[PDB]
């Protein structure tokens, strides 16, 4: 038991760091979805002007 | 306890390939092979009193091994298995000669 507690603690911390990578990834995933939609709408301006 | 016997007291730097059976605070019974890098020290290598003090303990090899093993085991006894393996050498080396200098 006193060694399984150590295994659980280290694996939980690594799971949290894996969630860190995942959540930071999803975070700028959102922002870059956002910025590319920015450029798309910037020229959808010309789309709808000329359409 | 009494295995080797020789006519000469080796004063040069040497080691003891000793293995201890320690137990940490998580009760983790683990044996561990030690070295005990040792060497005799004599500031005045002609004085009869100090020179004869070399042969004070007749089993200096066993005395050194037992003392270091005892203190190492006692200090690892206060730490979890996770700590005893993260700072393995760190805590065992401060176990042998625990101080702050």
**Any A CB within 8 A of B43 CB:** no
Residue B22 β-bridge partners: B30
Provide the resolution (angstroms): 9.8
Give the C-alpha separation, A12 to A9, whole Å: 5
Q: What are the φ/ψ torsions at residue A31 (nearest 5 degrees)?
A: -60, -30
Structure-determination approach: cryo-EM
- Å between B25 CA and nearest CA of chain A: 8
Q: Which of B77, B78, B80 to mutate to test the interface with A (most CBs of A within 10 A)?
A: B80
Give the C-alpha separation, B10 to A46, whole Å: 93
Rg (CA), chain B: 16
Task: Name the nearest CA neighbour of B82 among B28, B15, B7, B19.
Answer: B28
Q: What b-and-e string marks burial along B44-54, b requiring 16 or more CB atoms within 10 Å of the CB?
A: eeeeeeeeeee
Cβ proximity of B20 and B34 under 8 Å: yes
Inter-CA distances, A45 with A31, A36, A50, B101, Å: 21, 14, 9, 72
């Amino acid at each position: 038991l006193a060694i399984e507690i150590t295994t659980n603690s280290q694996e939980a911390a690594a799971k949290h760091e894996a969630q860190r990578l995942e959540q930071e990834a999803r975070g700028r995933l959102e922002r870059q979805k956002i910025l590319d939609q920015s450029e798309a709408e910037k020229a959808r301006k010309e789309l709808l002007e000329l359409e | 306890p009494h295995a080797r016997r020789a006519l000469c007291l080796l004063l040069g730097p040497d080691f003891f390939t000793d293995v201890i059976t320690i137990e940490t605070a998580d009760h983790a019974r683990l044996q561990l092979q030690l070295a005990y890098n040792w060497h005799f020290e004599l500031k005045n290598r002609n004085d009869p009193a100090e020179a004869a003090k070399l042969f004070s303990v007749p089993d200096f090899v066993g005395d050194a091994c037992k003392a270091i093993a005892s203190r190492v085991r006692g200090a690892v006894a206060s730490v979890t298995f996770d700590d005893f393996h993260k700072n393995s050498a760190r805590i065992i080396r401060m176990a042998v000669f625990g101080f702050e200098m």
